[PDB]
Symmetry: D2
Subunit: 147 residues, 4 copies
């Protein structure tokens, strides 16, 4: 519910930035949230090795002052990287992990309200696989029938 | 090209009914097309066992007189069934085969021109798999995080 | 008519009614929830409450959703002259359920039916629930999305010319 | 600067530039087609012809397509103080290529970048093509479609209430 959402090519755990991090321009994780990341790490470790985990950082488009970060892309990158590193510290194999920065792109909801702007400041843990059976079927048929 | 098309959940070989069958209300395959079905059967036999083949019948919405068939669903069903049976005769395991009837539904193109009506009279051989890795991932996450 | 096994089977032992695969959703309807028996296409009119719900919930889905009614049998021998194969028997059962959905207000433009013929043998120690599942009708919900395919086509034409 | 291996490598031995997986398309760009070397984020300005084409073809795709620029390394040790990890090095390379796409007219609203850090060891008898592939940037084309997920949600809520 509040955390889990399904999309057609994988699953998403949505972690609000204001809950996860120390302040609005920080990439340090709140100590009382560390074992929630461990909880996620433990579930990942039980999944098949073929599952990939992409830790995705997003911001809204509120400009930020008095910070070392010079773009929403940089802030989002540092946040996603931090969460990814903690997953590794709690036992997830790095061969299953990547991080992404979306900056202010791909918002959950339009940046048209205070509620929506807060929704857009989040880290998403995206679970998927690199399934290619359909692609391989198509390539074989293409070889045969494409004149 | 003319025959092969990819969609996001599988591949399609499109066989025009006017080329494949004896006449507009017949389900008998033209003798000079039989080894084209064999050609398809041979490619299927080389694919992994996990591939399923659904032979899909479609019509346009031209009414038909002086026929034993009482609906587009019945005509489409008989045509798809015939092609499926020939695939079995040429060696495809029945455990990989089903047939479908769409009647006049799901047209390729709107029934607004002679060219489009002819396009809509076809049998599609649909190749896919019952992949469920993403569904299983989601079920595991749902167990854990849905309060 | 209703067979003494259709009549007696409890619902507790059934598998999950809803299954998900990566390309769509499946409502699995064992024979006894739809038909008088597993060897003909005669609808049990006294079970139609369940089909009405499905029709009702199908209105909460968009026009783009495709609904495919799928028929299965096991290796039970054919009883009636009118079914010449298990493929035919399963097609008739699926078609029948599809028509009930239409009767109950589902848009015919979104409906199709399929037949898988026999897909399971008769096995020693099979439960009655497993026999009813082997003669199920499924309602399969999917789309024919081709967005990702169109992307690949554009790229393949540009970077892999013949 | 350009390293004597970036400079010399032939294109004949490269793998396919375009790969398809079931969730999207991947353009695989070995290090030498983009950067002066495999250990820094300095773009080879003399290779930018190739990036311009990609930007050009990205306009033939719809707004709904998401473009993710992905950086990879192997276990080559870090050369520069400024990269503190392979994750950081790959992120910087990916970010750099993403910015070139923006320069060349790709809508920033469709762009993101990723880093996979090191994903391959240094192996005996590796070709130079394989080293360049291990330090590639990928452009990954996908969507966040949720049509099938929304169908399942509706059905699960109705038939599997808590």
């Amino acid at each position: 519910g509040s955390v889990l959402e399904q999309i057609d090519q994988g699953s998403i755990l949505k972690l609000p930035s204001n809950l996860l991090f120390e302040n609005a321009t920080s990439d340090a994780i709140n100590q009382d949230m560390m074992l929630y990341i461990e909880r996620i790490a433990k579930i990942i470790q039980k999944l098949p090795k073929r599952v990939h985990i992409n830790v995705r950082g997003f911001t809204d488009d509120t400009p930020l002052v008095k910070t070392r970060f010079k773009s929403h892309y940089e802030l989002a990158a540092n946040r996603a990287y931090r969460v990814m590193k903690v997953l590794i510290q709690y036992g997830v194999n790095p061969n299953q992990l990547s991080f992404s920065s979306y900056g202010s792109t791909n918002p959950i909801a339009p940046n048209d309200s205070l509620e929506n702007r807060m929704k857009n400041n989040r880290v998403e843990i995206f679970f998927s696989t690199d399934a290619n059976d359909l692609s391989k079927i198509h390539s074989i048929l293409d070889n045969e029938f494409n004149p």
